[PDB]
Amino acid sequence: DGKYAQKLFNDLFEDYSNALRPVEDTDKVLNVTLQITLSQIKDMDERNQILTAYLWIRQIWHDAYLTWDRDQYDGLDSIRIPSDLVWRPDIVLYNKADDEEPVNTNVVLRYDGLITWDAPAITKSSCVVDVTYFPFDNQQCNLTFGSWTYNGNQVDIFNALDSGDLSDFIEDVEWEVHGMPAVKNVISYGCCSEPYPDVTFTLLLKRRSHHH
Ligand SMILES: *[C@@H]1O[C@H](CO)[C@@H](O)[C@H](O)[C@H]1NC(C)=O
Numbered sequence: 001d002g003k004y005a006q007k008l009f010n011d012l013f014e015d016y017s018n019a020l021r022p023v024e025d026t027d028k029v030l031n032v033t034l035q036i037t038l039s040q041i042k043d044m045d046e047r048n049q050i051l052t053a054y055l056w057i058r059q060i061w062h063d064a065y066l067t068w069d070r071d072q073y074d075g076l077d078s079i080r081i082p083s084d085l086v087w088r089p090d091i092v093l094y095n096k097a098d099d100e101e102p103v104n105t106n107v108v109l110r111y112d113g114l115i116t117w118d119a120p121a122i123t124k125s126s127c128v129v130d131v132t133y134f135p136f137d138n139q140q141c142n143l144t145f146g147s148w149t150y151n152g153n154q155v156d157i158f159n160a161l162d163s164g165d166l167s168d169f170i171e172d173v174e175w176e177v178h179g180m181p182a183v184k185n186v187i188s189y190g191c192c193s194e195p196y197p198d199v200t201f202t203l204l205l206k207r208r209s210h211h212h
């Protein structure tokens, strides 16, 4: 009984471009919320001052062109669609230190155009040491995310949460996570430029104690 999911798919995509920002009117902004879930601290390189982190990135937004009437599809109200088929906001890690592989994913598309996209990621980024605050062996590792393609009048980005999600991550032997607070920064240039937003997570690491 996937008959309806196929009908929907064929219907949604008869005339649909994954290159067109999916708003009904071009001067409307499209908002995206971002949540970062830390999965593991793969490597803290103190020689290069580079953090390698494994994350889950969750992006949520509305697509104006991918809606449908549940009644016309035997109640079907959600479908999983390869992510390459839909327009995406092109949110990437701005402060990559890296070179810098792909891994394919699906989005969940709800009948009201709401797209939820969970995708794994590996980030390499530079960190700054601090030995001012206890235990005097710490790292401040910023991760800054933003659209590579769109300015803030086109795509505006927001934190879903006050901080990165640290509920479940593999945990590193040398470094403890002290926090990962999130902020949003919007920069505009000179008197009159378009805005350029990002969200930044500051992962605060402190050297693990092995004493007591
Ligand atoms: C985008 O985000 C803000 C929510 O804080 C809201 O004011 C605005 O209405 C939203 N616009 C659209 C088109 O969703």
Ligand SMILES: *[C@@H]1O[C@H](CO)[C@@H](O)[C@H](O)[C@H]1NC(C)=O
Pocket (backbone or CB within 6 Å): 128, 140, 142, 183, 185, 200, 201, 202
């Ligand atoms: C890290 O990001 C936060 C929030 O944007 C910022 O306040 C802080 O200056 C950044 N740290 C460095 C070393 O750039």
